[PDB]
Design a protein around this nucleic acid. Sequence first.
RNA 1: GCCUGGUGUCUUGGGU
Lengths: 137, 45, 66, 113, 49, 47, 263
Amino acid sequence: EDSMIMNQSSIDRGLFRSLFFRSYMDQEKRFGISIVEEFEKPTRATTLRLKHGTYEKLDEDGLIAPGVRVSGDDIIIGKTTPIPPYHTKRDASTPLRSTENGIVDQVLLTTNQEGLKFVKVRMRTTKVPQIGDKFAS
Amino acid sequence: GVKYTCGACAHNFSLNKSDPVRCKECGHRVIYKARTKRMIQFDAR
Amino acid sequence: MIIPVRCFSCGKVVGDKWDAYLRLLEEGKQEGDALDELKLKRYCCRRMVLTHVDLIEKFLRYNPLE
Amino acid sequence: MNAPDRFELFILPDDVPKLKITPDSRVPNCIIIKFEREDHTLANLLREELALYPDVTFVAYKVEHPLFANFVMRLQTEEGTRPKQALERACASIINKLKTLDHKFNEEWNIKN
Amino acid sequence: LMDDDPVLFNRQPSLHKMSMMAHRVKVMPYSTFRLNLSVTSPYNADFDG
Amino acid sequence: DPTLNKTVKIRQGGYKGKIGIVKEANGDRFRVELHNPNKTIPIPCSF
Amino acid sequence: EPKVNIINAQDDEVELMLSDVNLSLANSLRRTMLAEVPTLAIDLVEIKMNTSVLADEFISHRLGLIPLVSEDVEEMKYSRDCTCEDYCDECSVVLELSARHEGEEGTTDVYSSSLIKVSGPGNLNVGEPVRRDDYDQGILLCKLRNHQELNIRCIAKKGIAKEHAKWSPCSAIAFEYDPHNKLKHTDFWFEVDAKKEWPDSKYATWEEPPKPGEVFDYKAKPNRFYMTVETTGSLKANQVFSRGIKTLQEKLANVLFELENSR
RNA sequence: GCCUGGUGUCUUGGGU
Ligand SMILES: [Zn+2]
Ligand SMILES: [Zn+2]
Ligand SMILES: [Zn+2]
């Protein structure tokens, strides 16, 4: 019924193996004259409603570095937003998609048209053919 | 503090986040984080 | 991307024969004969060299990012 | 994500016996031998050897599922012989034939050297 | 979930009552659902995706 | 516990010599997120 | 009673006829040589720097496929069976590679000949990447252009092909018997005439055709098995045939041990 | 020292 048997040794030598890339984008938003979000590694003492994942792969600039393996729900971009009227900020960080893993490949840092900070994190992993994957002549 | 790399002239330098986001050498506004200090292992499979 | 180390189907090493194959084509040999000289007799091994596409020469042209 | 470790094909867990013999009491003098962490490679070799012995009346095997490296063999012998002993005899015969076979290859090899 | 627990199995579109039958679980490696081949017909199932 | 999230090397068993990170350390049995295949394993503390 | 007649021979392939054995034994020998004859192969790659255009695990994947001299591998232990703390000199070989391109022009091709053995279980002849000649650069790994560098440390380990195909010592194993189909194990497809439409085996002249009158010998069994074992150079062809037999012996021996201990 | 919240409305492209 239209399935197929594949030679496992062929897969081992590299048949139909492929790279997969995903990019995440984030930027700081403006809410007032001097009220801006800020990239940082958020301290648990000063920021409320933190995510459940680990923050231990972020460097001090709020950005993860290339070469580090990441798994689902890990934070890779730390960002906070202040709470209007210490202990004043709220987490606005971006976790890796729960179903994925791989290696951080490259991190772009720049500014956008409005002058605030702007980052992109590209993650790469390798997908190896397995039972259930789809092929066609 | 954190190593970066200029997207145009490849000069390396650090920034302690409050500095403006540019290259000291050429003024290029696209920069990249340098790789982690940690060792990376792969199983070669 | 770059010549595979092994033939996918049978496992014979073919990653050391890529340079030898390009040189034989400059001397005017036909593709079938060039493969014959390299002793790639089974057609599983022949597909590997005959149909590979060398894209790495194109990727290197993009001026290094450090 | 759900692929099992490939080394599990040949590495035996500590709580798992390499070999398990149980009786088939429904007929006289019949055993079921379950082989753990083995293949057609071993199984087919033993099976044909056993079938040429005059006192083996039934021998068969099946690999129940290729995703699990095991197989189960069924062996029945006539009243005189004990099945488990007969299996030992089949083993020693093949070890001997391969020892001989290894020797004759070595001799022929030096002549062509 | 463990061996021989009953579960309800179902493929859309559920055009008639044999689109939903109870099967006995067998836990297995790899990430696809396995069906004995003779039940593909009532589900109008095949394995092309 | 003082060893969560710190990098670890495995010295016995089938995963001997591989890098990992302590993902969860409830008791005796650790959860190391291995680097090499995309899998997180249960492992004893002696290892 | 088993007999062998070697038709041809050289370093990396042996063609031979095998006779007076059972079909199952010829097949089990075929499978054992492909799957269970141990070899040595890279199994851990520590990348300290890779600024080439190839992805890290892509390069690492090619490294695993490089055939290494595995002649003395029988005295070496499996990593999973060694009593030591992390690795050591008894269960692994360490290899190192470092390449770089200086100059603004041209391309530096990184070849398998730049793999330098750094340690290893001396003085056993194991771990060198196989070479055809002495001026043969070997297998292409990567290519580098100006300022791009590759500096990696590789750990090679003993393994078998059941775990991953990179540990296989063979490539193809040609295998056939009964070139004139006297046993009638196949029923030939034909349009007009079966004999003219099917090509001859390359061993058709090593056995005599069936006579036009001859009745079917329902007692005849397969008895002559011609096979050619090609290798990748990780092991010499004579070693593979010998160690295939040896490995198959211990497996049967292990079964024999377990029966006399279970009582 | 237990609890533990991350959007919606569309549109478009796809799968059987
Ligand atoms: Zn610059
Ligand atoms: Zn081939
Ligand atoms: Zn050791």
